[PDB]
Write an enzyme that holds these catalytic residues in place. Structure first.
Site, PDB file in Angstrom:
ATOM      1  N   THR A  66      -6.172   7.513  -1.591  1.00  0.00           N
ATOM      2  CA  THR A  66      -6.223   7.845  -0.171  1.00  0.00           C
ATOM      3  C   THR A  66      -5.720   6.684   0.678  1.00  0.00           C
ATOM      4  N   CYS A  67      -5.325   5.602   0.014  1.00  0.00           N
ATOM      5  CA  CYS A  67      -4.879   4.390   0.695  1.00  0.00           C
ATOM      6  C   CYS A  67      -3.565   4.563   1.465  1.00  0.00           C
ATOM      7  CB  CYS A  67      -4.775   3.224  -0.298  1.00  0.00           C
ATOM      8  SG  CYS A  67      -4.257   3.688  -1.976  1.00  0.00           S
ATOM      9  N   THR A  68      -3.063   5.796   1.524  1.00  0.00           N
ATOM     10  CA  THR A  68      -1.831   6.098   2.255  1.00  0.00           C
ATOM     11  C   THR A  68      -2.120   6.496   3.693  1.00  0.00           C
ATOM     12  OG1 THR A  68       0.117   7.529   2.388  1.00  0.00           O
ATOM     13  CG2 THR A  68      -1.929   8.510   1.561  1.00  0.00           C
ATOM     14  N   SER A  69      -3.320   7.018   3.920  1.00  0.00           N
ATOM     15  CA  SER A  69      -3.739   7.430   5.248  1.00  0.00           C
ATOM     16  C   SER A  69      -4.353   6.255   6.013  1.00  0.00           C
ATOM     17  CB  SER A  69      -4.724   8.599   5.154  1.00  0.00           C
ATOM     18  N   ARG A  91       0.808  -1.214   0.000  1.00  0.00           N
ATOM     19  CA  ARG A  91       0.000   0.000   0.000  1.00  0.00           C
ATOM     20  C   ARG A  91       0.846   1.271   0.000  1.00  0.00           C
ATOM     21  NH1 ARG A  91      -4.849  -2.148   2.351  1.00  0.00           N
ATOM     22  NH2 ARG A  91      -4.294  -1.664   4.527  1.00  0.00           N
TER      23      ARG A  91
END
EC number: 2.3.2.26
Lengths: 609, 154
Positions: free
Chosen positions: A579-582, A576
């Site tokens: 927005t998949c970083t938050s 990953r």
């Protein structure tokens, strides 16, 4: 003709109106137009794209085919749109006033960044993107009208008399999109539905009943609903959604899990200074959860005293939220675990109870984390700065109470005390040499000599839950990468940089684990850095900062794999990261606190906690 | 601020019990963190007069003690020739913010009434006390006359 002629044909038609000439019935009638794929800014004066500019008033754009066209930052007044198509349009901050848009497609592009408004507009039977500022729109009664078309193809819920589309399946991605208005710059279906004016509480509730009934059939588990716990209550916990029986039932368990997760997180650590949204939409729920779990007030006094403090000094706190707090507090002071410590003389108004008018009164009573007899009596002005340190914050301005009696703190080291009995301040009493230490690493990544802009900006972004300034623009890509790519040879962590990171934190001759846990944390902080919250946005995310975040995680694993929750969890975090970083930033942090929280609060900005 | 909230009460608490030893309480309207008072000894050889006194509070009061200075010359084994006095209660590393100042002064006045050459601050006078009470009192007496404040009438 082509749309280009439709284009340069409205250009100089609202300019005549801006020149005086009124326009007959035929004049202001641009029906069946086609403006597909036309960036409207190029053939428009720079005034319609400016705040308090000009309004396009008195038209009739029925049957228009806007699909793909950008109508960003433009304000329409008194216009007709019935039967148009805007699906895939760009409309950042667009506005439509006193203009009817019935039966149109509005599922605009995820491209748009700011929500468009609808002051005094009507959307009777329109398909909408679940994100929209409807703070003026006047809805209609739901007509018999059949549902919108689809091809398998999801189902739609009805919001008064508008049409909203549920996802094909609540993948974690579907969830973090529709529901989480925190990770998403304040945007969500919950915030969209509640944006309706304060009287349509009938359709507003209905619409939410229809949305819970959707999720109720998702089969999704406690694990998958946690990152939207805070976003759900913040809206669903306040009236009118308290009246709704079907919504209260479902939300109950969700709020028990919220309070629980908050009791684990902020009972030992300073709850970061609350913005307005928090003061208005969160605290009241915390006061509520405390009022239902009486026992909690004492067993988790650490958090309680925070949720109270912040309530009684929240600039934007409702007089109800203040009263509940005050009142919730007279309960706590009467508890037989607390009232013994009350030195009847100096405390509160010297008459037993707190004097909430003054900020410099001994209103607060903190309980020891380890001992049954030790308690701390201190003031609002004081507890405030202890919990939000300054370079000159004094760390002893309190009455140490050792079983009702006061004791000298001269010859008692603050550090030792905070460690044993009062854990809450330790993460804060350190912040003066934790920030410098962190600073010494950012001065290393970003050279002060050449780069100074970014620097004060990275530094700046540390004392605020979010930042307005982002870095997904093209000049900040070439800029960043020219600073990160030398630190990451072959996608691994530069051996020279790593050595600097050690000397920076005095971990040079440390144990591999204490080192892994520190790199883990730095990786967590630079994860936060490349999230919507900080320098990233909902869909874009700085590639270097993510490549550095993952690189730090590597050496962590390399030094001590015991640190990580599992072999496969490292895999998935690594993936990953590329927005998949938050969603990882939190996961890593949830993990970081559970197993090495003293190493975390020494690296993460108290402001981010 | 907190220091003034506390002092405003510390004060009226003392203007409550009119201990006949200390009077008149003056606060300088320049600081308020500086008080003047006048102690009137009960036991000889200090009846002949009285003694002015300034009590200066640090800004971080009540979390750091005050220090008391004698603004009147006094011939005493436990008091500097420059006015300085050593009290256990208001020395740092022995100080608890809860201590009522009505009692620190009570202490000072008790130390002036019955001198304790045990742990003195002026061997000069301390040896004269324990070896020559007659003579010591004969000197303190005349020194209170010459340099001491005027005895209150009421």
């Amino acid at each position: 003709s082509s749309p280009a002629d439709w284009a340069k044909k409205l250009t100089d038609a609202v300019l005549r109106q801006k020149a005086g000439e009124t326009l007959t019935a035929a004049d202001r009638d641009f029906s069946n137009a086609d403006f597909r794929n036309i960036t409207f800014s190029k053939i428009l004066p720079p005034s319609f794209m400016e705040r308090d500019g000009d309004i396009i008033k008195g038209f009739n754009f029925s049957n228009s085919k806007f699909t793909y066209s950008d109508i960003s930052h433009l304000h329409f007044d008194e216009c007709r749109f019935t039967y148009s198509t805007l699906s895939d349009v760009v409309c950042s901050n667009t506005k439509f006033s006193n203009s009817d848009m019935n039966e149109v497609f509005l599922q605009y592009s995820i491209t748009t960044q700011q929500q468009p408004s609808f002051i005094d507009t009507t959307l009777k039977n329109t398909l909408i993107r679940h994100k929209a500022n409807l703070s003026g729109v006047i809805l209609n009664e739901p007509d018999n009208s059949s549902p919108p078309s689809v091809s398998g193809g999801g189902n739609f819920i009805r919001l008064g008399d508008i049409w909203l589309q549920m996802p094909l399946l609540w993948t974690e991605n579907a969830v973090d999109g529709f529901l989480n208005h925190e990770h998403n710059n304040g945007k969500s279906i919950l915030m969209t539905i509640d944006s309706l004016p304060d009287k349509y509480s009938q359709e507003k509730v209905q619409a939410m009943e229809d949305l819970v009934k959707s999720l109720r059939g998702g089969r999704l588990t406690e694990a998958c609903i946690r990152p939207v716990e805070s976003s759900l209550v913040s809206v669903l916990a306040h009236p009118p959604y308290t009246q709704s029986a079907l919504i209260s039932e479902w939300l109950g368990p969700v709020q028990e899990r919220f309070f629980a997760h908050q009791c684990q997180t902020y009972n030992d650590v300073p709850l970061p200074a609350p913005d307005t949204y928090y003061q208005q939409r969160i605290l009241p729920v915390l006061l509520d959860s405390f009022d239902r779990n009486s026992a909690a007030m004492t067993t988790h006094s650490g958090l309680f005293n925070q949720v109270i403090l912040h309530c009684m000094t929240g600039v934007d706190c409702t007089d109800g939220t203040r009263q509940k707090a005050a009142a919730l507090y007279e309960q706590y002071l009467a508890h037989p675990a607390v009232s013994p410590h009350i030195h009847n003389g100096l405390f509160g108004n010297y008459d037993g109870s707190p004097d909430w008018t003054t900020r410099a009164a001994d209103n607060f009573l903190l309980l020891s984390s380890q001992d049954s007899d030790t308690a701390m009596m201190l003031s609002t002005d004081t507890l405030l700065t202890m919990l939000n340190p300054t370079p000159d914050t004094a760390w002893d301005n309190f009455y140490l109470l050792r079983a009702g009696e006061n004791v000298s703190t001269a010859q008692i080291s603050p550090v030792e005390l905070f460690r044993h009995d009062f854990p809450v301040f330790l993460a804060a009493f350190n912040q003066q040499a934790t920030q410098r230490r962190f600073g010494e690493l950012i001065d290393i990544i970003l050279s002060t000599e050449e780069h100074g802009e970014l620097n004060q900006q990275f530094l700046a972004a540390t004392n605020q839950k979010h930042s307005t300034v982002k870095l997904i623009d093209d000049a900040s890509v070439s800029r960043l990468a020219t600073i990160f790519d030398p630190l990451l040879p072959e996608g691994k962590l530069s051996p020279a940089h790593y050595q600097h990171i050690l000397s920076a934190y005095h971990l040079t001759d440390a144990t591999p684990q204490k080192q892994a846990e520190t790199l883990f944390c730095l990786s967590t902080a630079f994860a936060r850095y490349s999230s919507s919250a900080i320098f990233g946005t909902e869909h874009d995310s700085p590639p270097a900062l993510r490549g550095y975040a993952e690189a730090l995680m590597q050496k962590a694993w390399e030094l001590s794999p015991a640190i990580f929750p599992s072999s496969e969890q490292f895999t998935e975090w690594s993936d990953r990261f590329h927005t998949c970083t938050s969603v990882v930033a939190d996961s890593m942090q949830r993990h970081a606190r559970k197993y090495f929280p003293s190493v975390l609060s020494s690296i993460l900005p108290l402001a981010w906690a | 601020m907190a220091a003034s909230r506390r002092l405003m009460k510390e004060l009226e608490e003392i203007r409550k019990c009119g201990m006949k030893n200390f009077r008149n309480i003056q606060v300088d309207e320049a600081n308020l963190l500086t008080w003047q008072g006048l102690i009137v000894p009960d036991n000889p050889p200090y009846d002949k007069g009285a003694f002015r006194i300034e009590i200066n509070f640090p800004a971080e009061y009540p979390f750091k003690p005050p220090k008391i200075t004698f603004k009147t010359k006094i011939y005493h084994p436990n008091i500097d020739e420059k006015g300085q006095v050593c009290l256990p209660v208001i020395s740092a590393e022995n100080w608890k913010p809860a201590t009522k100042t009505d009692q620190v002064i009570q202490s000072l006045i008790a130390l002036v009434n019955d001198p304790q050459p045990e742990h003195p601050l002026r061997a000069d006078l301390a040896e004269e006390y324990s070896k020559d009470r007659k003579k010591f009192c004969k000197n303190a007496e005349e020194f209170t006359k010459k340099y001491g404040e005027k005895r209150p009438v009421d």
